[PDB]
């Protein structure tokens, strides 16, 4: 099937499962000391963070290829409560998503887009679209 | 309020502007020849191969 017909969240969760068990996807450099878009004042708790974040950058590349830090951290971000201040938006972790893109661009599941960016390979497309049919025929939520 | 106020006042200043564009495939001269009917009203006419 198409990777749209699977649930968006379980698509990325099982994408993280596949890449994690393949062990290739970047394992964390420091698990809980990441500030992760400092609008997220607290920390990430479990070492299954980078799997999902890189998987989701790959999925947003599927949504549209050739993206970048400014145009992916925008959707990755959200709302923050600012103590004695109101809420603005200033996207945080740049090198986390950059290292996502590097760890997959050296992996040739995301390839160079024209003039800049990270575009999509037939290999990444085929792998993710197989896992899509896998998950869809399996149970779902 | 110039300087005599007792409350909050906020006016506005709005305008009407436009950019209206013909797009023709002729040489640089026959366009001059065919065009003489735009300099009757006041609207800035600029004829160029590429964008002005």
């Amino acid at each position: 099937v198409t990777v749209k017909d699977v649930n968006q969240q379980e698509f990325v969760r099982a994408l993280a499962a596949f890449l994690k068990k393949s062990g290739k996807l970047k394992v964390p450099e420091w698990v809980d000391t990441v500030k992760l878009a400092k609008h997220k004042e607290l920390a990430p708790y479990d070492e299954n963070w980078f799997y999902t974040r890189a998987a989701s950058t790959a999925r947003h590349l599927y949504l549209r290829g050739g993206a970048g830090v400014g145009s992916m951290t925008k959707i990755y971000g959200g709302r923050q409560r600012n103590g004695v201040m109101p809420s603005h938006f200033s996207r945080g972790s740049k090198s986390v998503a950059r290292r996502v893109l590097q760890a997959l661009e050296g992996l040739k599941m995301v390839e160079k887009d024209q003039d800049w960016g990270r575009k999509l390979t037939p290999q990444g497309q085929r792998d993710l679209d197989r896992i899509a049919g896998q998950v869809a025929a399996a149970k779902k939520k | 309020t110039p300087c005599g106020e007792g409350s909050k006042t906020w006016d506005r200043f709005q305008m009407r502007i436009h950019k209206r564009l013909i797009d023709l495939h002729s040489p640089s001269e026959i366009v001059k020849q065919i065009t003489s009917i735009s300099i009757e009203p006041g609207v800035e006419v600029e004829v160029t191969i590429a964008d002005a």
Binding site: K4, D5, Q8 | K8
Partner: protein, 141 residues
């Protein structure tokens, strides 16, 4: 042409354009799966007409919709208006009156609210008040 219908629809401002198309019978909103706009609470919402307009009349339609603007449920009524707006001409213009008779009536048999949406919109803030009608409070000494 003479074989499909591609016209618009919208809530206050969220605008979709639906195209009912001759084929095998398929439904797709945003060029994405039907339910899977995923409000995840209004999972019930956009299959009421789909299961109450005639499962037979949902057998030949290949719905493709191009959408943008505003908010989520606003875009939901955008598509819900757009699909009806296309199929009504799909039935009246290209096709006879008997085919019209069923769905023209089912229009209000759901509700007349769908052919044309609200003539409403949010309008400009009026100063001296934090919204459209309220007023900044009047203080003393």
């Amino acid at each position: 042409p003479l074989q499909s219908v591609q016209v618009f629809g919208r809530k206050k401002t969220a605008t979709a354009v639906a195209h009912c198309k001759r084929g095998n019978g398929l439904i797709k909103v945003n060029g994405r799966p039907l339910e899977m706009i995923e409000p995840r609470t209004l999972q019930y919402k956009l299959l009421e007409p789909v299961l109450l307009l005639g499962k037979e009349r949902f057998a030949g339609v290949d719905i493709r919709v191009r959408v943008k603007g505003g908010g989520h449920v606003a875009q939901i009524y955008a598509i819900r208006q757009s699909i009806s707006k296309a199929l009504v001409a799909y039935y009246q213009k290209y096709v006879d009156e008997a085919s019209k008779k069923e769905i023209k009536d089912i229009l209000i048999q759901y509700d007349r609210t769908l052919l044309v949406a609200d003539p409403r919109r949010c309008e400009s803030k009026k100063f001296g008040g934090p919204g459209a009608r309220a007023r900044y409070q009047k203080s003393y000494r």
